[PDB]
Structures are given as C-alpha cells and as structure tokens.
C-alpha cells in the first residue's frame, strides 16, 4: 500500500502569509498526487490534481509542486477562507491511499486562560457522585497542560477533558477538565486544585476551593 505521510500535523499561520503544507509518499508515485480541501463542516473539495494542475474555481493562490516522493502545497498570501484541513493522495497504485491531513489554525496575539474551578454540587452528591470541573477558558496558543491536586497530591485519575476548536469569532481555544470522584473520595479530602501551564505565564495559575469551608 503506498503510505503517504503528511509530516505536519497542525499548522498555525497569520493572514496574508505563505504556507507550505507538505506530503511524502513511500513508493515514488510519479506525480499522481492530488490535494483536497476539507472546510469546517464537512465539505471536501478538489484543489490541485496531478501535482500542480489547478481545478476550476480554485484560486491562483494555491499551487503545487513535487516529484517522485516529495510533494508540497503552497498557499501564497493566506486568506480567511483557507482555514481548513488539507489532504493529499496518491494515484499511481491502487488502493488510493491519502495523508492524515494538516489543519491550518489562525495565529493571533497571545491570550491567557481565564480559569475557573467548580465544586461538586449537592444534587450530584445526592445522586452519589462528585465531579469537580475546571474551565481553562479563552486562550492562545493551543498548547496547554492542566494539573489536578486532590489535597497536596497530584491525580491523573478520572480526569476526562474536552478540548476545542479554534473559535470562529475570536480564534482562541477553550477547555473543560472533569475530575470524577465518588461522594466518599470527595468526602475524604478538603482543598481541590485545578492547575494550568500556558505560554503566556511564568507563573502557574492555580485554582482551588476548600471542601469544608462550606
């Protein structure tokens, strides 16, 4: 099977720049390489076919080039309508394989997480559980690490967390971090601590609350 490697997983960029998405096949695929664009909300569309040939309606801003095993897509002068996922595939052999994709994000000025810790509510405790959740909210870049401390001790145990898309409106990322305890595990500890490490800070923002203090 030809294994095609989109070496770049996720690519961040400012508007008006030149980006080069890049694809490497395992066999020499004699310039049977095509580039497809997947927009947000599902839509896939053909840009380039046969390495460098453009498709009808694809803007001149897109262009390709490659040979043998290395191929590249160039978006000269990045516009807003190019935020998408770019896939490439070979056409020398069957079955037609594809690359894993490369997502363009928009680079915008740094933003710090507006963090918030949340206590276990009475109604869930009455239901017999405990979900301490943490909102690491509105931040740039996508890189962040969160850290839980049930009392002074760190706990990667039942921390199921939902990351997010780069917002349509303000280009930032938000993130949920649910620590899921039982009414007695919770009932055997006092301070709970959600903890965040982000680009925009040489100080770990820590978020807490004391169980019985209320």
């Amino acid at each position: 099977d030809i294994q095609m490697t989109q070496t770049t997983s996720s690519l961040s960029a400012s508007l008006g720049d030149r980006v080069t998405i890049s694809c490497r096949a395992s066999q020499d695929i004699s310039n049977y390489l095509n580039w497809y664009q997947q927009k947000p909300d599902g839509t896939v569309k053909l840009l380039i076919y046969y390495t460098s040939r453009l498709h009808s309606g694809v803007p001149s801003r897109f262009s390709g080039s490659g040979s043998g095993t290395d191929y590249s897509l160039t978006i000269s002068n990045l516009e807003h309508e190019d935020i998408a996922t770019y896939f490439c595939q070979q056409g020398s052999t069957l079955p037609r394989t594809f690359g894993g994709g490369t997502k363009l994000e928009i680079k915008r000025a740094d933003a710090a997480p507006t963090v918030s810790i949340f206590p276990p509510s009475s109604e869930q405790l009455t239901s017999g559980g405990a979900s301490v959740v943490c909102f690491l909210n509105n931040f740039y870049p996508k890189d962040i690490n969160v850290k839980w401390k049930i009392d002074g001790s760190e706990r990667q145990n039942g921390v199921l967390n939902s990351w997010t898309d780069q917002d349509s409106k303000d280009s930032t990322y938000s993130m949920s971090s649910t620590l899921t305890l039982t009414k007695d595990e919770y009932e055997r500890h006092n301070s709970y601590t959600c903890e965040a490490t982000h680009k925009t800070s040489t100080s770990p923002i820590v978020k807490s609350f004391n169980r019985n203090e209320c």
């Binding site: 053909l46 896939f87 079955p95 507006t114 949340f118 206590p119 649910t178």
Partner: protein, 221 residues
C-alpha cells in the same frame, strides 16, 4: 451543475447492516465512477471502493471487501453501499465521490466532486436521558470582576442535547465544550461568563433539552 446528494444519517445497533445512498445529478450517471471514502474523526480520509455504472468495473480496497457491497440503480442515478456486520470501529463519515472522466489505472482520475457526507454512529445502548447539574462558583473563590458559571450535563443517549443560558440571551460568553462518550454515555458542558454586577444578583439559568427522551431540564444557578 454536478451534485451528489447523500442519504441522511443513521444510528444503528451493533452487528447490524446499513445501506447508504448517493443521488447523483448534473451529468450522465453511467460515465463517471463513484468511489466511497470513510473518515474516522480526526483520522485521515480512507478509500473503500470504486464502481463505474457503465463500464462494468468494481474495485474495492482489500480490507473492506469483507464488509462492503457497492451496488447501483442506473435509472435513479443512485449508488448504495451495504456495510455489513456493523461494529464500533465502523462509526465514521462516508463520502461518495465522483471520480473524473477518463477511467482508472495509473490514476486517469481524481475525486472531483464530493457528497455532503453520511454519518453513522454504531452503538448497542439505549436511550438514556441527561443529568443537568449546576456548576456554580468555588467557595472562597475570591470574588472576581466577572463570573463563570457552567452546566455539567452528565450521561445521555443519543446525542442532540441543547444548552441555552437564560432561555436565549447570553449568546456570546458561552462555550459548548463538545460531548464525549465515556462508556456509552455522552457528557457535555457549557459555560457562561458575566460581570459580578449581573450575578448572584440575578437569574442565570441553564436550559438543557434532549428531545429524543422528551426531556426539558431547567436549572437556577
């Protein structure tokens, strides 16, 4: 002109069997092969098979020969794809894609026209209704200049939960973190942010409503 209309999503139980469709218009159905491509979420695209309604050729990716049948209604310009013995790993998005007018060998084709996609969740788990919790400020969380308030909506099935702060008002400041099934059970969250001038001073309410369960939970916060 040229459009490939698909079928409309389906939720199916394990070991079952779907047949999806692909209504094609714009051109002569019979002269352009139709391919089927799968996409597991955040994994690459993937090729299943190809069929041409007028040359008499089928080729399938070898790992899909086992569970797939590409067939055709030449008079309704439709193409169907029977995916059988449906498991967890088969849950994905399935695009049909018109190949271009040549044929099929050392390419001579590329996928020049894609369908809207058809989703297929495969779960052997019944309709469970949501559990709308209030998540309201930590005690001793030293009184900010704005306040974040969130609703944890633990456990439910199927999807299509809505969350709505103040029955529609706080449309910005709100973040719907996407649901993520732990064991069968979906789970979601939503936050809202307002200055201290607006809460506990006022009425912030969370409005979850998962229709295929006939649920409507409101919550004072």
């Amino acid at each position: 002109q040229v459009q490939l209309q698909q079928s409309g999503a389906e939720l199916v139980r394990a070991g079952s069997s779907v047949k999806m469709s692909c209504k094609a218009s714009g051109y002569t159905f019979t002269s352009y092969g139709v391919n089927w491509v799968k996409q597991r979420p955040g994994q690459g695209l993937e090729w299943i098979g190809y069929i041409n309604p007028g040359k008499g050729y089928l080729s399938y990716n070898e790992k899909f020969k086992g569970k797939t049948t590409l067939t055709v209604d030449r008079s309704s310009s439709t193409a169907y794809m029977q995916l059988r013995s449906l498991t967890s790993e088969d849950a994905a998005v399935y695009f049909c894609a018109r190949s271009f007018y040549g044929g099929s060998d050392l390419a001579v084709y590329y996928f020049d026209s894609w369908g809207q996609g058809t989703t297929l969740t495969v779960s052997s788990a019944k309709t469970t209704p949501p559990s709308v919790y209030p998540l309201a400020p930590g005690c001793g969380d030293t009184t900010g200049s704005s306040v974040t308030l969130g609703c944890l909506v633990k456990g439910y099935f199927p999807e299509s939960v809505t969350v709505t702060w103040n029955s529609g008002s706080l449309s910005s400041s709100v973040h719907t973190f996407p649901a993520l099934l732990q064991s069968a059970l979906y789970t979601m969250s939503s936050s809202v942010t307002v200055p201290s001038s607006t809460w506990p001073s006022q009425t912030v309410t969370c409005s979850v409503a998962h229709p295929a369960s006939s649920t409507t939970v409101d919550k004072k916060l």
